[PDB]
Design a protein around this ligand. Structure first.
Ligand SMILES: Nc1ncnc2c1ncn2[C@@H]1O[C@H](COP(=O)(O)OP(=O)(O)O)[C@@H](O)[C@H]1O
Ligand SMILES: Nc1ncnc2c1ncn2[C@@H]1O[C@H](COP(=O)(O)OP(=O)(O)O)[C@@H](O)[C@H]1O
Ligand SMILES: O=C(O)c1sc2cc(Cl)ccc2c1Cl
Ligand SMILES: O=C(O)c1sc2cc(Cl)ccc2c1Cl
Ligand SMILES: [K+]
Ligand SMILES: [K+]
Ligand SMILES: [Mg+2]
Ligand SMILES: [Mg+2]
Lengths: 310, 310
């Protein structure tokens, strides 16, 4: 019965599999309405934006998704549900490039309107409903599996340190490939903490912020790539939220860029311009936040806050 | 000709002392108008607040100050100016307890109105005009002196590290007296920096924040007062501003208190409740800011930003 924003992830067990049917019907009740909501969003886009071929592509994908979902017969038995799972999987696969297509689509078309507020509002709303969609969908699929410490996509005892480490190794590799080195990362504060949590949003955000911190460190120690300052991560765990402070000595975000870094499409180039604003939208959708503190000339502290599960 | 908020501190020299006369006339032109502005502020206070004996005391002090200032004859020669200096000194002495009297005065009387916004607005405005007053006045007096590296109260080559150190020693002493120990303080980033700057606002703010950070550290290591985590201060110096990050491992500001810590009179007790909101008002008056980042369960980062001199 664990819930986030007006939407619940179904926590429940049964040896026969009656939990699968109620979950499946929930998705069948929930998904279509929300795709429809996002189709209106496409219909309300400024005409010249909505006309861009890629914007239209994604537009069509969303209609197709609605069509397929509503055409599916109401679920009554395991064999129905099992086959609905096939459709959910197909949809996930089909829609995996959507963020990128949206980025490409809006890149040019966005300058052609005077209303700056509109695209931000559209992306925030589209991308966050989509996260909610992938969460709900991946959860249902995961409910089939019998993995240790997981009720669906909900880890019962998640380790912030362990997940940070997963993404550190990843980001370091990428950085080594581009620069020949990467900063070491140290992790302090509540390194021993374990609690119920959904990893998925951490899996988008963490690598984004790690990417940014590593780039900035390297791009400001171009004379000594072999010796760079560590990035330092602090985990704080309390009864209300989890806070992860990612703090670097990469020179800061310049005063001139400060007001634009949270803008979609804005970048100083790991070069697409979506890391910061997507991450923030995700965090706020989940009831937390993402806040920057620039120390121009020294570095940046990035604060990720996510609410605990009720 | 160095200026801050619609007001200029006079930078100039002369062996005969013609710079003193123009400065004196400036003060004579400026102070009265601004005292008058603050008298209206007293006149507009909710009646039941304005009636409190201490509030009235300060009210009278401001009238007396206006009376004395406007009664002073226009300045024409050194001997005039010299005597105006005596009056400025007297006013400074007379008004030194004003913040405290205001705190005592408003403590009870403030609950008696429904408008929470009003007292904050009154204090911010009164206390910041007063800082501007003491700055202008102390500057003029200082212009008599011939100290190295000082044009008035404007240090020509101020060292952030050195001023932080001054206030560290101070705060540590206070903390040792109360707890039997204090955290060591380390200072990193641009420790070698020197630039023109006015120390005065740093002299109010720095000890306030150092006080808060030391208390929190001790009040959360009550089992090991002999061994506490360091407070760590980071100086960043760029072309736009000076940033001083004061960061502690004192457990954070709790979610419940977070919205109230910037309120005048609010405190969890070094016990008066004015440190944070006064400091922030001062910083914003000077064109910078003061921002908190709580890591509940771990500690707090406090970010002080002050603009450089034009
Ligand atoms: N830790 C950081 N240090 C310095 N600059 C940063 C940091 N994080 C983000 N930025 C700046 O803000 C911009 C926006 O970042 P983002 O939205 O992730 O897009 P991208 O990283 O693809 O440019 C970056 O291009 C970079 O200029
Ligand atoms: N570094 C800090 N760590 C923990 N709590 C703090 C810190 N700074 C301020 N606070 C909290 O916010 C309150 C407001 O501080 P302030 O305005 O300086 O008043 P006072 O220190 O007199 O209580 C403090 O009482 C304390 O509870
Ligand atoms: O945009 C996406 O990634 C997804 S995944 C997904 C899964 C389902 Cl079951 C329905 C819609 C939908 C969308 Cl839209
Ligand atoms: O409130 C204060 O501290 C001061 S000092 C001060 C000095 C002068 Cl010259 C005039 C007013 C004035 C006030 Cl009000
Ligand atoms: K961006
Ligand atoms: K306070
Ligand atoms: Mg990025
Ligand atoms: Mg205080």
């Amino acid at each position: 019965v664990r819930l986030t924003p007006t939407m619940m992830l179904y926590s429940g067990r049964s040896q026969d599999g009656s939990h699968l049917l109620k979950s499946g019907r929930y998705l069948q009740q929930e998904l279509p309405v929300r795709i429809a909501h996002r189709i209106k969003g496409f219909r309300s886009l400024p005409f010249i934006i909505g006309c861009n071929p890629t914007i239209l592509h994604v537009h069509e994908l969303y209609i197709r998704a609605f069509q397929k979902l509503t055409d599916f017969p109401p679920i009554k038995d395991q064999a129905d549900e099992a086959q609905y799972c096939q459709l959910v999987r197909q949809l996930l696969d089909d829609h995996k490039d959507v963020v990128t297509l949206l980025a490409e689509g809006l890149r040019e078309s966005r300058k052609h309107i005077e209303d700056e507020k509109l695209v931000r509002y559209f992306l925030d709303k589209t991308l966050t409903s989509r996260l909610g969609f992938r969460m709900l969908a991946t959860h249902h699929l995961a409910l089939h599996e019998d993995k240790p410490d997981f009720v669906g996509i909900i880890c019962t005892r998640l380790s912030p340190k362990k997940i940070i480490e997963k993404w550190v190794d990843f980001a370091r590799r990428l950085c080594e490939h581009k620069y020949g080195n990467a900063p070491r990362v140290r992790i302090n504060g509540h390194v021993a903490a374990r609690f119920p949590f959904i990893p998925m949003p951490l899996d988008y955000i963490l690598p984004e912020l790690l990417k940014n911190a590593m780039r900035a460190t390297m791009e400001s120690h171009l004379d000594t790539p072999y010796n760079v300052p560590d990035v330092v991560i602090t985990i704080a765990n309390n009864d209300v939220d989890l806070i992860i402070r990612i703090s670097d000595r990469g020179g800061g975000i310049a005063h001139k860029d400060l007001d634009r870094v949270m803008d979609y499409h804005f970048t100083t180039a790991h070069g697409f311009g979506f890391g910061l604003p997507t991450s923030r939208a995700y965090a706020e959708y989940l009831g937390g936040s993402l806040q920057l503190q620039s120390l121009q000339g020294i570095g940046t502290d990035v604060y990720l806050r996510l609410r605990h599960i009720d």
